[PDB]
Amino acid sequence: AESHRLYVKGKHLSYQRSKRVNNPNVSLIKIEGVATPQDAQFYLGKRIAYVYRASKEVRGSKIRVMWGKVTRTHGNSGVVRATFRNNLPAKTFGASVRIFLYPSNI
Amino acid sequence: GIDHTSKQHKRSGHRTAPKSDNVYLKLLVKLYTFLARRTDAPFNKVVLKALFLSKINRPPV
Amino acid sequence: TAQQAPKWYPSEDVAAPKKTRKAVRPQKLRASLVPGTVLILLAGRFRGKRVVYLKHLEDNTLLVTGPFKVNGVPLRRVNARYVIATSTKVSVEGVNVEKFNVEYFAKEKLTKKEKKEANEIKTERVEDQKVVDKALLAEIKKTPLLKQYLSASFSLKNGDKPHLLKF
Amino acid sequence: ASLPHPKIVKKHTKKFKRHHSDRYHRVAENWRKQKGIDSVVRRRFRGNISQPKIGYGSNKKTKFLSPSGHKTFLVANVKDLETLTMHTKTYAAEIAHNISAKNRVVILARAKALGIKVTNPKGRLAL
Amino acid sequence: FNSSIGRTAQGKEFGVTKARWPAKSVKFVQGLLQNAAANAEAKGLDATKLYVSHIQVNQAPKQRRRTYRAHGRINKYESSPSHIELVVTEKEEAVAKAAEKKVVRLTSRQRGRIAAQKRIAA
Amino acid sequence: VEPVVVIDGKGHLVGRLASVVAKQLLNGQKIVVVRAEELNISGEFFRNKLKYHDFLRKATAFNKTRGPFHFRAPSRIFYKALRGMVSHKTARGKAALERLKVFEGIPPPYDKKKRVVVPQALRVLRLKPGRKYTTLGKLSTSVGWKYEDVVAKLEAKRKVSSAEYYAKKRAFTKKVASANATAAESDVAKQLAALGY
RNA sequence: UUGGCGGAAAGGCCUUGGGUGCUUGCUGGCGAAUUGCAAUGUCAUUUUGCGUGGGGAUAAAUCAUUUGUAUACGACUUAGA
RNA sequence: CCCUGAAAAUGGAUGGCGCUCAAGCGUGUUACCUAUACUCUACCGUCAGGGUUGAUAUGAUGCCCUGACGAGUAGGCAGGCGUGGAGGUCAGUGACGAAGCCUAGACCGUAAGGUCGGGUCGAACGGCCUCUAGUGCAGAUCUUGGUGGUAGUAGCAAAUA
RNA sequence: GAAUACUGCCAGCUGGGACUGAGGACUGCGACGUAAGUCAAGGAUGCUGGCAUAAUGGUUAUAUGCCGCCCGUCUUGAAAC
RNA sequence: GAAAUUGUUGAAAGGGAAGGGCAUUUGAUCAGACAUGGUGUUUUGUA
Numbered sequence A: 001a002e003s004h005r006l007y008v009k010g011k012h013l014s015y016q017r018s019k020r021v022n023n024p025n026v027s028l029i030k031i032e033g034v035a036t037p038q039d040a041q042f043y044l045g046k047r048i049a050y051v052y053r054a055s056k057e058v059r060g061s062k063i064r065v066m067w068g069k070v071t072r073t074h075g076n077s078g079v080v081r082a083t084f085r086n087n088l089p090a091k092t093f094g095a096s097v098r099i100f101l102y103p104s105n106i
Numbered sequence B: 001g002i003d004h005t006s007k008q009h010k011r012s013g014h015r016t017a018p019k020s021d022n023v024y025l026k027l028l029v030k031l032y033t034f035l036a037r038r039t040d041a042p043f044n045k046v047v048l049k050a051l052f053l054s055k056i057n058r059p060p061v
Numbered sequence C: 001t002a003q004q005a006p007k008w009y010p011s012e013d014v015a016a017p018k019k020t021r022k023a024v025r026p027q028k029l030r031a032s033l034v035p036g037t038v039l040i041l042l043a044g045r046f047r048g049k050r051v052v053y054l055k056h057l058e059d060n061t062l063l064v065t066g067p068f069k070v071n072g073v074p075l076r077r078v079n080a081r082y083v084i085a086t087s088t089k090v091s092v093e094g095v096n097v098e099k100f101n102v103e104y105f106a107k108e109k110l111t112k113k114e115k116k117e118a119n120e121i122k123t124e125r126v127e128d129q130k131v132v133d134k135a136l137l138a139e140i141k142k143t144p145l146l147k148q149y150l151s152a153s154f155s156l157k158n159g160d161k162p163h164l165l166k167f
Numbered sequence D: 001a002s003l004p005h006p007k008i009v010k011k012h013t014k015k016f017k018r019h020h021s022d023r024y025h026r027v028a029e030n031w032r033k034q035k036g037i038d039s040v041v042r043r044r045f046r047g048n049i050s051q052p053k054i055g056y057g058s059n060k061k062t063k064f065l066s067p068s069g070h071k072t073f074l075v076a077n078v079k080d081l082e083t084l085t086m087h088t089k090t091y092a093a094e095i096a097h098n099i100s101a102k103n104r105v106v107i108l109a110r111a112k113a114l115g116i117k118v119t120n121p122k123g124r125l126a127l
Numbered sequence E: 001f002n003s004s005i006g007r008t009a010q011g012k013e014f015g016v017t018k019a020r021w022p023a024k025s026v027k028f029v030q031g032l033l034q035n036a037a038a039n040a041e042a043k044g045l046d047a048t049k050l051y052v053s054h055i056q057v058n059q060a061p062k063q064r065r066r067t068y069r070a071h072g073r074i075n076k077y078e079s080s081p082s083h084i085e086l087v088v089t090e091k092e093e094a095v096a097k098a099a100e101k102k103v104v105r106l107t108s109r110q111r112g113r114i115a116a117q118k119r120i121a122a
Numbered sequence F: 001v002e003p004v005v006v007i008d009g010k011g012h013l014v015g016r017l018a019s020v021v022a023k024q025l026l027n028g029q030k031i032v033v034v035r036a037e038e039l040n041i042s043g044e045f046f047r048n049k050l051k052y053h054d055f056l057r058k059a060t061a062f063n064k065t066r067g068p069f070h071f072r073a074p075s076r077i078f079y080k081a082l083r084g085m086v087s088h089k090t091a092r093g094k095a096a097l098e099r100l101k102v103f104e105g106i107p108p109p110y111d112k113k114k115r116v117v118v119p120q121a122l123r124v125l126r127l128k129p130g131r132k133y134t135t136l137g138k139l140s141t142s143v144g145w146k147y148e149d150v151v152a153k154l155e156a157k158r159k160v161s162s163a164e165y166y167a168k169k170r171a172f173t174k175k176v177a178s179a180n181a182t183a184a185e186s187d188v189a190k191q192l193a194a195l196g197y
Numbered sequence G: 001u002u003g004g005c006g007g008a009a010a011g012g013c014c015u016u017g018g019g020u021g022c023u024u025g026c027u028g029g030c031g032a033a034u035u036g037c038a039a040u041g042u043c044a045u046u047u048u049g050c051g052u053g054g055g056g057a058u059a060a061a062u063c064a065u066u067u068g069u070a071u072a073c074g075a076c077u078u079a080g081a
Numbered sequence H: 001c002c003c004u005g006a007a008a009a010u011g012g013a014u015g016g017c018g019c020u021c022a023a024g025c026g027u028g029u030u031a032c033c034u035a036u037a038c039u040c041u042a043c044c045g046u047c048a049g050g051g052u053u054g055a056u057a058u059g060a061u062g063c064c065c066u067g068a069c070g071a072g073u074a075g076g077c078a079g080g081c082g083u084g085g086a087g088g089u090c091a092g093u094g095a096c097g098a099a100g101c102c103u104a105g106a107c108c109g110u111a112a113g114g115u116c117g118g119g120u121c122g123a124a125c126g127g128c129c130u131c132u133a134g135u136g137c138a139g140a141u142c143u144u145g146g147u148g149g150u151a152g153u154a155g156c157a158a159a160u161a
Numbered sequence I: 001g002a003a004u005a006c007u008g009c010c011a012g013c014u015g016g017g018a019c020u021g022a023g024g025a026c027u028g029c030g031a032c033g034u035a036a037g038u039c040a041a042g043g044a045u046g047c048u049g050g051c052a053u054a055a056u057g058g059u060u061a062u063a064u065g066c067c068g069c070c071c072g073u074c075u076u077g078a079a080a081c
Numbered sequence J: 001g002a003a004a005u006u007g008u009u010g011a012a013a014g015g016g017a018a019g020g021g022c023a024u025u026u027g028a029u030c031a032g033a034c035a036u037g038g039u040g041u042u043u044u045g046u047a
């Protein structure tokens, strides 16, 4: 067809933070479509990929991926907490990111 | 935080393993620490503690 | 001497591990996976394609087929955590899948010397595929539009919420 | 070829540098504790440099081990090298910096015969 | 070294405003340029492709005199002399080409994808 | 969900719209706000004129040129209210603010596009009926904006052209609705009705 | 390709005619495997350079000289085949 | 509750934007955010309580088991790192290159520090057990010596040329 | 004559998610079993894939998010005008 | 033949200082493990 998307779009909002101290080890993700923790409970444990590009070709590609997963819900509005192998570079606040449907329970 | 009722990390204040560098005294306290550990007699513990003592705590008899 | 010595050397004998208590009970699959279910492949080379599930294998994998005449997916095994069990059900009674096992799919592992600088199929595999898919498509022809459904790919459109979608 | 060990973890892999060693050239970056009465580093304010303490200490099963898994032992000649004959899987030899090349070839030959690992088998070598 | 010097129209060539005419420096530099051209023709160079490839100036030891200031004080009056060196070379052609081999590492999935593309197209 | 979101600023409250839009930019949504002369501020016109005069008094004493700049256009008033809610002095704030452009009227890049509203910042949904409000264009031309009438003339021309568009669109959709109704009650229509479409 | 309309930042919208390709509106035939149980598995647009081969056109500014409606110096205003 | 009473000097502060059935005031119910605090786990150290001379191989100040604890100026104590020189030892290193110096190169230690590779260089130096002291610097308007910014700056204009 | 709400109990069942895997022959307390034996009972094992190299990682420079006042001294109090 | 301080070359950043801490992107640079004993001799220098 014309669409081939097998993931859900999301936005990298910020780190986990207090009013004046942030914590880069936990990122905050807005998954689009979900507006409550009860709907966000479907997406727990799903893999997340941040997909970006670079000028230098490394192993056949100019596209590099950072992997992570959803761990828990955050707040009352469907924001989730996500942890990555290496933390997200904080210039990606507001950048798009992919939530895959695996590991599936359905 | 703990509301400590005592001084933390304090030494017991009783001298063990005597401050002398006498090798025969160290052999004697090795023998008597074996005896105090395993013979379950109070005499061995008493003489083991008396072996640690300094000169002014060991008056001549 | 430059360095003097260590007064004690550590022993070089390696100790044995303790006797473990982790036995292997078999995998308890989720309830939506019954044999004959149409699955959607979430990842892999054939991602977004709808296949039919036949047999639960020994290494917790699912035996699936396209059929190969419909969408070009061969006889294959997939992971149960990488599929979506749709509610669409066909009957796979009349297919002899006990031939396939974990030794049926062997990669014939490659040596470190054989490096592909620049750059085939088992005949046993191809007539096994031809035996099973002609038994599947006879069950496919009963209810309408299943051949078209299995040939078409799955993809998420704008406005599709997977937490609200029923498959 | 080393003895099996747990995963080596460094609690603080960054070097502890003296406060204002970046600021003044007369202040070397060897660690000194701030004994000042108003020092933010001594008072441990947020956003300042961290200080060395006993909590950063390495695991006793992991301490003094190279990433290869051996402990470095400095050697000066063949008789010093031969002390590691029965302890090859725990210690690795390192030729001292002041050994000449014509002795270094002898030490490397004897270590290769005895199966001993040398951590610097490239010093003063001509090609 | 240009703070508080005068401004001039002849810096428009170089996009600056502050420019001067250091006659003594020009005399010394052009004497060294003449000597280097003489060395080049003695060595047997082309004498038409020469460009000044290297030049640097750094400080010689100072030469000190005295200055007499009010209320009977002495200050310094020091000359700051120069060490100058320069190298003229012939302008050659393009330097080099044929860079590194850049050996590639591909996974089995990448190799299967490239083989699939090579099969699926011509 | 959208590449660019075009917001019709008419009938909106300035602070509530700015707090919606600033969060949208910080999340990464591109926003363009049109018709900035029709924003509303709650309160009397005299109260908001006094507020702007209190703001207009504030300037740097030794040099007025480096003081706070008092911008007079309604779009720049909205930009001031939004820059107050974005941390504009950082690189993240600058990158957020470059995803925004605010206009008086609807310029020709955006007069053929779709305009949306924000229902949690709409005056008729937020204020109690009876409370008094202002128009940002009236306040701005009271404090020194020069282009209130040329925007009105351009908006009149644009509305005439848009009504000419809408008449044709309405005629076409009535033809399409007539054909859909006559092509309904067939077998595919009843099967789609059973399946929910 | 024909005809319009659009100046707020128009640079876009509509329309006439023919060509050409596809059509999943409906019914068929062949292909796909081996990326080995997943690895973004690579499909977008931004700028520049160098080659082709096809058009298009053949300038000024500054320094120096000069002026004094200008001027600390720069700058400004003039003149000079 | 709101309003009058209610006047100060640079421009101005419920923190700012702003907010009017509030994003105000009174009150109630839930959900949610996060401290070096609490719970669980790992690791480091300290303290305490214990086990273990049996043969083989070492270290009994050793090895092992268990539990609790960890803020800190003035100050006290303990364990260590480094320097000049001395007794002993490694029949230590070295002109096939000692010492020194440079090195956004590598390794070890929580740290003081230690080790290696490369460059430069040219004649002595090191590990360990002990002994000894003119033994560790950022400051003292510290001492001696050297060098900057200021800065191509102030200026080099009395005595007719 | 019932139901339901509210509160409380179950040594009732069961689904999803995250972090941790310390220890290293055996010894103990138990459970299911007539027994052999088995087990979730004094701390993680089994199966599989890719790569085997700057890919992970270390160092260093830069960028981004948040934080960070100049040290020493006297002082009740120092970033101190 | 050190440092202060300086010249050239190279790399990098720079909207009213610079420097630092935690974390990661990007660029540059770099260490370690990769054999192992092994059924085995498909073997040459026959062990």
Ligand SMILES: [Mg+2]
Pocket (backbone or CB within 6 Å): D021, D022, D024, D025, D026, D027, D028, D029
């Ligand atoms: Mg320094």
Ligand SMILES: [Mg+2]
Pocket (backbone or CB within 6 Å): E067, E068, E069, E070
């Ligand atoms: Mg004078």
